Amino acid sequence: MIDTWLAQWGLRLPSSNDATLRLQPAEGPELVMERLEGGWLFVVELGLVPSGLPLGVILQLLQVNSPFSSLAPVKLAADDAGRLVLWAEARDGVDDVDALNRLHDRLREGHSRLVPLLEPT
Amino acid sequence: MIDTWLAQWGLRLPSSNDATLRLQPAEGPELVMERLEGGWLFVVELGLVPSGLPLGVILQLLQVNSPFSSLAPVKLAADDAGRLVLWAEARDGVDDVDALNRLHDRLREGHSRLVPLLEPT
Amino acid sequence: GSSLRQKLPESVSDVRFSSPQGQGESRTLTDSAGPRQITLRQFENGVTELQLSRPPLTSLVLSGGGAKGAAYPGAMLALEEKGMLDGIRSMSGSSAGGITAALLASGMSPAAFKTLSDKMDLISLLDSSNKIGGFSELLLNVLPRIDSRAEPLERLLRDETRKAVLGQIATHPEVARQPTVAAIASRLQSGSGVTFGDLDRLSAYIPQIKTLNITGTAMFEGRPQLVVFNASHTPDLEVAQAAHISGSFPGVFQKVSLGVMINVPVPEMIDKNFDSGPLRRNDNLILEFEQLEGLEELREQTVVVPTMPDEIKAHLQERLQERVGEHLEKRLQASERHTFASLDEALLALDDSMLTSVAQQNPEITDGAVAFRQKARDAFTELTVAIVSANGLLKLDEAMRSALQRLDALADTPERLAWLAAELNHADNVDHQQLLDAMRGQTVQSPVLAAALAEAQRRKVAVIAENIRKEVIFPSLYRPGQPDSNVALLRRAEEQLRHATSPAEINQALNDIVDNYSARSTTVEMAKAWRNKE
Amino acid sequence: GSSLRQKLPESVSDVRFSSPQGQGESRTLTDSAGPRQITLRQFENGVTELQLSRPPLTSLVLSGGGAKGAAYPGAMLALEEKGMLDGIRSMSGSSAGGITAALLASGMSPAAFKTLSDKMDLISLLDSSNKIGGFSELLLNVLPRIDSRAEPLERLLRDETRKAVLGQIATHPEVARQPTVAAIASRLQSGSGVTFGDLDRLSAYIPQIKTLNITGTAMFEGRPQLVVFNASHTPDLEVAQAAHISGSFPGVFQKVSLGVMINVPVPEMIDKNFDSGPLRRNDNLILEFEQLEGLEELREQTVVVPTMPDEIKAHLQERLQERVGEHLEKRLQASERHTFASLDEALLALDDSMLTSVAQQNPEITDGAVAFRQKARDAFTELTVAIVSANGLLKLDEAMRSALQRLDALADTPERLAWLAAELNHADNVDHQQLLDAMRGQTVQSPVLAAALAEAQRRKVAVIAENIRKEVIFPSLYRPGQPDSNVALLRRAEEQLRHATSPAEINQALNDIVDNYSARSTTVEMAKAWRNKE
């Protein structure tokens, strides 16, 4: 069902597929998708967490994770290298084309909203 | 299946049940459980986000949300009042006693780990 | 402190419900007792559940906007039709409904009001064919200065109001004879307008005169400000003047030297009050256009009506009539539930009347509670005789000590000590307040007095906080340009302030703001100013 | 910049794979070409996939700990048994294996080594019956001072090594006659120990002499420090001295004035090198006890063996023999895959040999690439003749210009310009480096030279970063008391440093640390010191 999500850009999931694929759309963030046990992990990168963020910004960051946020189920986190990341988790079975299309959009929405909060710091 | 999770403390889900139940165990954090469409939301409170956190602390906060964290699937967020919260989402059907027991423990583990990071600030 | 939104696991030992929750079968201690239908259920584990009829309708909140206040007499009829207009004791309106509640508080009968609105729906539409401290006392001080005395609207209102009030005075010639009233109606006949001070003063005598609260939100410096006209802040200012001022859409600041926005958010009109217990003292009928009193509980009390001719305006006075008709009977079949951890806690939540009702019906249940209430009401008088006879000559004489001893004896559980302190805090009770003001900051032998004093300081602190919310936060929070980051910070300062119990915590609120607000100056100044003053 | 761990939706228009990925059917351009079995597959959309045999085994990394280095000769046999001991050119060991690789680099044959380890497994166990800059040059300067010259271990190693090296010299009397060698063996026979400088110098002549790298981690001030003994940092220091020093479990700091920890983390021994392309130049056999070279790729190259008698030690020399036997044949049936965006990119990734192999087999594919390679190799000599004859008398004469012109002409795609710059950066190539050092900071007519110069500064910057990682981060990161908050900060500084391309970015790394590290002083000082120096 991922392969038919791909299909709509005339891309096909590459044979001998290993860990990480990376999609770069014509506008906006690159999409990194690792592969899991029974699902793919979509992720969008926002840069290394900046030093000296103001409280309000910290808050707006944390608030992205309320179970009620407009971006659900996308989550905001940092990886072990301190890189600020939005991610979601697409399962095989459960999810499908329309649903993956949603994840993707919520990731881009999250990325555009936040990305100016860091840079100007 | 929630009612049998309760049952093990000789508590029973109260009749005329409305929005929010609150469990206070003999040691450790109070557990707030709202009720949803088809599931309950467990939540643990950590206080209002402090002003002037150091970067490393911010980082350790964000890192709680990596899909690979030892606390998964518990998430860290702030509510609209700026209150720092750990939460998980228990669905009807899917989850059961052993599983709810896990959520709970991961919440308490998260709460003890982090709670000293804020106070001393 | 609640959350607002809009590998083997090692065991957790034994866990209770942090709130009280009935467990097991319930017996019913008292079924439908009294006018307010008191029901007490009690459970195997002690927890007592109270169920009780919705509080008395004592208030009318009228939201502004548009010109559509030709629908308004729909409700007015619906009120006297079902006959609960008498029962109203307060009226509160903003913007366009700000005028309307003026008229009504003034005492204008239901039928009287309509004919006026049928020559008003011209005027209300022709005025749309026309169209330290804060921005509150600098209004409160700019009024007597360079403002054109009486316009077509000021005159018309001045007279409408003056007719109603003077008319009621006569229908009730038992009050007319009382000095203070006859002082007010000789003012009115001299050409003076009705003030709040007297609308108030008259509502104590005659029940068809209502109090008035007109709220309004003025932009200054892009920053909306709350402004209130009521009996307490602007007592002698004229009702007419204000209702017109708050007719001003966005209004000029004379340039004096040193959802949308027209809405005053509903809850900024409804009053903060310190009820002795978990029981709400009244209900609101909230008419809208298009003990944290929540969204959900406010929805329940809000009915929301869906170049103007004269027959479509009738239609609107029928649609309203009818919704405000179904509501009022429905509201009559709905309830309030309160859960307590013990019988005595729930008998404490009842006023003496309600108590007395439960007592009539099931005296076995209440004898203890009536015993306690009787002795408290006695000790509280006994204490008042002391305070007063001491003014005869500050110093707690023996007689106060004795009564404080009698009160201390009644506080044999933490629940009752809390009740006894709150009772002694009634702002309305001049003599008790006389004593708390005096022992302020002092260490006292009596536990009850020690509670009461602590309770007093908590309240002092809460009004300070509320003042700051209204004048440092509210303006920034609803600045149109406000980036969400900034909003997050203040929505948090609000939270801090809500829970503030000591001046020190209040200081910290403001510092969080100074330290973390990006001018992306004034809010920050404003805060600095609050932080340094006592 | 990768991620490390351990309502209708409006459309997204057209989206490619950011990396190259084969789409559609593949043809095979060249099957198994050469010793390294080069396979090229090419896809409908251009993307060329390279598959190639694992690189040559040229390195042996020996991890320390325990005393269990009586298993070690298991492998040593397994190596000469399958006959790839010749092929080794480097040996790297820490702690307990630090001694072992000394012995072996010295040139001690497989059988020779064993008998020694059977009088060594007494000694290795009896030594357990016994038991600005940094902490590296203050070791490097504390050696000649107040340290007891030669112990039982120093002597025994001094001689073992001196026998092997001197023995090989003779078996190869063609080299013995060469001045520099005969200079070294007259030193050795005089009583001197083998240094790194010469272990190195001898590995160029004889292939049974190997280079040596001994790593070790010394606690100072609770803060572990990396310390390296190799041909480049400690060239004339004796191999014996070091292997003993790094025998010191935790070792005394003489008190000179101004998983667990004994492990030097594997990757701190394996060498950072700048390969002209995406191809790894060699493989490691990593023996362990109990182009970011990842965990996963390091696992693939690591075989991990599972009062000592003399027969159980044999058992261990059999278990090892056998695992290090299956590995070596398996490793022979595994591959490397590299994906490129064009044929020419993948022909660029091949060294001249490999290129020549593909050429033999399928000349239609490569003629262009061989044409280009030939002209580059010509132009690079032509340029070297220029540089050298200019020393005859800095100033780019015409002859260099001409060759830089010839190179500029070959760089007709961004891929080849990159290749041409890297080629001109070979640290090993004294004459090219002579020129880059001279045009440092200068603006030059030639694009290739402009690339090469930029590439040079990138590298300069990377070694600085690597130096800082090793001496500001590494010590703090693995301080035992370190709260996770602090670890997060530094794991991030590492990330910053890894990707640092300019001095300014390096400065920012360090500031992030100064500004945000809670002494919960020294790391911060350390950083301050790096930040001010050029």
Numbering used by the authors:
A (entry chain A), B (entry chain A): 1 to 121
C (entry chain B), D (entry chain B): 28 to 33, 54 to 178, 202 to 328, 346 to 377, 411 to 426, 445 to 531, 535 to 661, 672 to 685
From the paper:
ExoU is a 687-residue protein that, once translocated through the T3SS, induces cytotoxic effects leading to rapid necrotic cell death; exoU knockout P. aeruginosa strains display greatly decreased virulence in mouse models of acute infection. Notably, ExoU has been shown to carry phospholipase activity with broad substrate specificity which relies on an essential catalytic dyad (Ser142/Asp344), as is the case for other phospholipases. ExoU is expressed by approximately 30% of clinical strains, 90% of which cause acute illness. It is encoded on a pathogenicity island together with its cognate chaperone SpcU, which is required for ExoU's efficient secretion from the bacterial cytoplasm. ExoU forms a 1∶1 complex with SpcU, and folds into three distinct domains, which fulfill catalytic, bridging, and membrane-binding functions.
The structure of the ExoU(30–687)∶SpcU(1–127) complex was solved to a resolution of 2.94 Å by performing a SAD experiment on the selenium edge at the ESRF synchrotron in Grenoble, and harbors a 1∶1 complex in the asymmetric unit. SpcU is a typical type IA chaperone, being composed of a curved, 5-stranded sheet flanked by α-helices. One involves the extremity of the 5-stranded β-sheet, which binds a short β-strand located at the N-terminus of ExoU (residues 62–64), thus generating a 6-stranded sheet. The catalytic serine (Ser142) is located at an elbow between β6 and the following helix, in a funnel-like region surrounded by a number of flexible loops. In the structure of ExoU, this region is also found to be flexible, and the catalytic aspartate (Asp344) is not traceable in the electron density map, suggesting not only that ExoU could also harbor a ‘cap’ region, but that the structure presented here is in the ‘open ’, and potentially inactive, conformation. Our structure reveals that the C-terminus of ExoU forms a distinct domain (encompassing residues 588–687) that folds into a 4-helical bundle. Interestingly, residues 679, 682, and 683 form a polar, mostly basic ‘backbone’ that could bind to negatively charged eukaryotic phospholipids, and facilitate lipid bilayer recognition.
